């Protein structure tokens, strides 16, 4: 009565689409310079990421001044002020969330947006395809428009210990409540991009009916989850004279300060993911998109785009039981029918797997998952973490 299917799907495809960073972000995380745009005459590269970066900010070297403070105007020499818009009046930047709801009060669909989307939608309305990137402080409910689209400027000539303006992107504790935003951050980020860290979970690879470990990973020392989320952001997908123009209050040259002009844009490809072990205090980073979670109570699955502190503890434990019990929609009880079971050898319910021997109750699974090993898998993890069909079953698929 119980036959097994040959079709090789994945129940995680829908859940894991927000961690496919190349698809859902389509630009760099650490340094984000994915789209080209005209500035006066020449062509320059600017932020194009389709998702928000929780905890990102520009650390200016040799500076007590914040990057969220306004750009240094005229008499403010050495460029030692910041990256945000000049503080002219404050009807475009900064804004309280209250004053965004007051300004766009009459509009229906703008009031339907969330706090991050509202700040961005506002910030990408000022005038070409050039728009200004924004920074939304959640703590203070403030919307900072950034004038300087650049992120890194840490070259070999003018930065090592010796007025020329140096900086890089980082995730320190002072930046944790900030949210870095390109002109393209989707208004539906909350249901399509990563924010929270996944508790009781490490990322993995679907190798025919069970989520397996990534073989090729970089181990590093991380004390807390913050240090792991910091390190991965430093490793993540990166898309990487003025003084006389700056002090004249030039609208166009200051807007393109430290911007590159010929395509080494990541498009979201890089060491974007990491698995943090709470017990060992090790952070395992890697540059292949994961295709599932392993349910391990000692792990936390994190990304460079994710927040440096927030953790969703509720693992999707029903995902396997739901997919097995949907795949019994040949009814459209068991007496007349026989059942073609799908290729899923892990479930919280043991009876649902229909394993040929005693399955493995995973001690470390919070969901109380049983895992059926005694069964011929039709796939393996080759070099570069590539899941591939085994030689024996190449011709059927």
């Amino acid at each position, epitope marked *: 009565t119980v036959e097994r299917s040959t079709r090789m799907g994945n129940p995680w495809k829908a859940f894991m689409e927000k961690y496919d960073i190349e698809r859902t972000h389509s630009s760099g995380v650490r340094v984000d310079l994915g789209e080209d745009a005209e500035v006066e005459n020449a062509k320059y590269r600017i932020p194009a990421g389709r998702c928000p970066v929780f905890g990102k900010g520009i650390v200016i070297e040799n500076s007590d001044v914040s990057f969220l403070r306004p750009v240094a105007t005229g008499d403010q020499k050495l460029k030692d002020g910041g990256f945000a818009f000049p503080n002219a009046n404050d009807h475009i930047s900064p804004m309280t969330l209250a004053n965004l709801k007051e300004r766009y009060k009459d509009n229906v669909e703008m009031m339907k947006l969330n706090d991050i989307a509202l700040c961005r939608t506002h910030a990408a309305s000022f005038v070409s395809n050039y728009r200004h990137p924004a920074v939304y402080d959640e703590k203070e409910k403030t919307c900072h428009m950034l004038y300087l689209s650049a992120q890194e400027n840490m070259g070999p000539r003018y930065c090592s210990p010796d007025a020329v303006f140096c900086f890089k992107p980082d995730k320190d504790e002072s930046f944790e409540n900030l949210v870095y935003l390109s002109k393209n951050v989707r208004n539906d980020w909350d249901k399509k991009c990563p924010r929270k860290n996944l508790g009781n979970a490490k990322f993995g690879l679907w190798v025919d009916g069970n989520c397996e470990e990534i073989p090729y990973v970089k181990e590093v020392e991380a004390e807390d989850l913050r240090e792991c989320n910091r390190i991965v952001f430093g490793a993540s997908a990166s898309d990487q004279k003025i003084q006389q123009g700056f002090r004249q209050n030039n609208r166009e040259m200051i807007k393109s300060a430290f911007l590159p002009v010929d395509n080494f844009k990541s498009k979201g490809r890089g060491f974007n993911w990491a698995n943090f072990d709470s017990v060992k205090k090790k952070c395992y980073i890697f540059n292949t998109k994961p295709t599932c979670l392993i349910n391990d109570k000692n792990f936390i699955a994190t990304t460079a785009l994710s927040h440096p502190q927030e953790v969703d503890l509720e693992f999707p434990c029903s995902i396997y039981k739901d997919e097995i019990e949907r795949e019994i929609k040949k009814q459209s009880s068991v007496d007349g029918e026989r059942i073609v079971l799908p290729r899923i050898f892990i479930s919280n319910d043991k009876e649902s797997i*229909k394993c040929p*021997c*005693e399955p*493995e109750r995973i001690s470390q699974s919070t969901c109380n998952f049983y895992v059926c090993n005694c069964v011929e898998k039709r796939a393996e993890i080759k070099e570069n973490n590539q899941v591939v069909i085994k030689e024996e079953f190449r011709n059927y698929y």
Partner: antibody
Framework: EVQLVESGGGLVKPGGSLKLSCAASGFTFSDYYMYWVRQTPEKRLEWVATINDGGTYTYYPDSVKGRFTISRDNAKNNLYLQMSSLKSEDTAMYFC?????????????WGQGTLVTVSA | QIVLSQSPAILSASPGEKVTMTCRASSSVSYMHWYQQKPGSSPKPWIYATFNLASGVPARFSGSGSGTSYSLTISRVEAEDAATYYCQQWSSNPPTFGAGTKLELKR
């Protein structure tokens, strides 16, 4: 400790029938899978059948398809094996066996055994 | 049916010797379990899954391998090890065992 005790083996004519029994104790019988393993006079171990926790799914090799039928009385901790259309190739010492917390397809506990001789 | 080929069939060895016995699968396997059998009793689990020794077994015994080649390894034989040893897989269905390797001892 875990306790497996087989019984109900003997002489059977080639083509007839017999049922076996396997008493279980020192563990909650319903929480585990149960199996059947035979050994020939030539000393060749062969897996005979598998049954799951609740008796909802059984598994058997093509050497004893259709003839053999594994079953379990979880009410009073017993395992059985009906053996239709017997043959001299089925002549062996028969062993019931149990899995483990490790789920690697191992035979952790075995009974002493019960002998089925099939000659005319 | 995966065909496990145990070799040698008989292995005589004096007390003291490091002696090894082989097991060889037709198709590839994840890991191999091993069983000791003394005469007039059912086989007891000896090594679970290539390397991991079972409960109660002397640490003098050992195990190893990958894919198709696997191998039980005694470090120093004793008269109580005089028994027939069987390798078994259940990484592809149906599960299969080897023929056997009868450890004899010298005197």
């Amino acid at each position: 400790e875990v306790q497996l005790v087989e019984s109900g083996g003997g002489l059977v004519k080639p083509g007839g029938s017999l049922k076996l029994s396997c008493a279980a104790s020192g563990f909650t019988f319903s929480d585990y899978y149960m199996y059947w393993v035979r050994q020939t006079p030539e000393k060749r171990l062969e897996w005979v059948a598998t049954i799951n926790d609740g008796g909802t799914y059984t598994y058997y090799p093509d050497s004893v398809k259709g003839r053999f039928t594994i079953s379990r009385d979880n009410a009073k901790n017993n395992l059985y094996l009906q053996m239709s259309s017997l043959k001299s190739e089925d002549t062996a010492m028969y062993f019931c066996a149990r899995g483990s917390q490790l789920g690697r397809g191992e035979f952790a506990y075995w009974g002493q055994g019960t002998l089925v001789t099939v000659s005319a | 049916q995966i065909v496990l080929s145990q070799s040698p069939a008989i292995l005589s060895a004096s007390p003291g010797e490091k002696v090894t016995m082989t097991c060889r699968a037709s198709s590839s396997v994840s890991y191999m379990h091993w069983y000791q059998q003394k005469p007039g009793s059912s086989p007891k689990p000896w090594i679970y899954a290539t390397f991991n020794l079972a409960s109660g077994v002397p640490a003098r015994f050992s195990g190893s391998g990958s894919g198709t080649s696997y191998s039980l390894t005694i470090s120093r034989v004793e008269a109580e090890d005089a028994a027939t040893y069987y390798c078994q897989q259940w990484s592809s269905n149906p599960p299969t065992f080897g023929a056997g390797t009868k450890l004899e001892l010298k005197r």
